[PDB]
């Protein structure tokens, strides 16, 4: 459903840009790649 560097939020039912999670303590696994480069 989401693009290359997005993740799907089960509770929002929305695709979120992973860059909103690089600052966070634990980004989603699917994002770690983009967030801080592979």
């Amino acid at each position, epitope marked *: *459903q989401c693009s290359q560097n997005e993740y799907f*939020d089960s*509770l*929002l*039912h*929305a*695709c*979120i*840009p992973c*860059q*909103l*999670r690089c*600052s*966070s303590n634990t980004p989603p696994l699917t994002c770690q790649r983009y967030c801080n480069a592979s």
Partner: nanobody, 118 residues
């Protein structure tokens, strides 16, 4: 405590357009909109980040609703096009001091009614 004041609600026909706005007394990182239809649980509509300005939408409104915020004015705007009758609901603007909008945000608006009629 941030105060959220909404405006722009009302009646529309299917296929029409309607603009909602919400003014906040202070600036949070995430600003957006939820909605609640009769006999349903409140559902996420849209949200947008402070910096960078990245917008994200529920799957059921993507391609039909856009969201934009004025960070100076501390406002958020939900522009709705291609309205369906199932878009009828109370629309609550929400502010969240989080990276991504949460389903339990820190602040809520009063709720403004939007009625889409066939």
């Amino acid at each position: 405590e941030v105060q959220l004041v909404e405006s722009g609600g009302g009646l529309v026909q299917a296929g029409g357009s309607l603009r909602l706005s919400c003014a906040a007394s202070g600036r949070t990182f995430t600003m957006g909109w939820f909605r609640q239809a009769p006999g349903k649980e409140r559902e996420f509509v849209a949200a947008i980040s402070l910096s960078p300005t990245l917008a994200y939408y529920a799957e059921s409104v993507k391609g039909r609703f856009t969201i934009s915020r004025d960070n100076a004015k501390n406002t958020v705007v939900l522009q709705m096009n291609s309205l369906k009758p199932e878009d009828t609901a109370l629309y609550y603007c929400a502010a969240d001091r989080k990276s991504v909008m949460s389903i339990r945000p820190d602040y809520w608006g009063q709720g403004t009614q939007v009625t889409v009629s066939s």
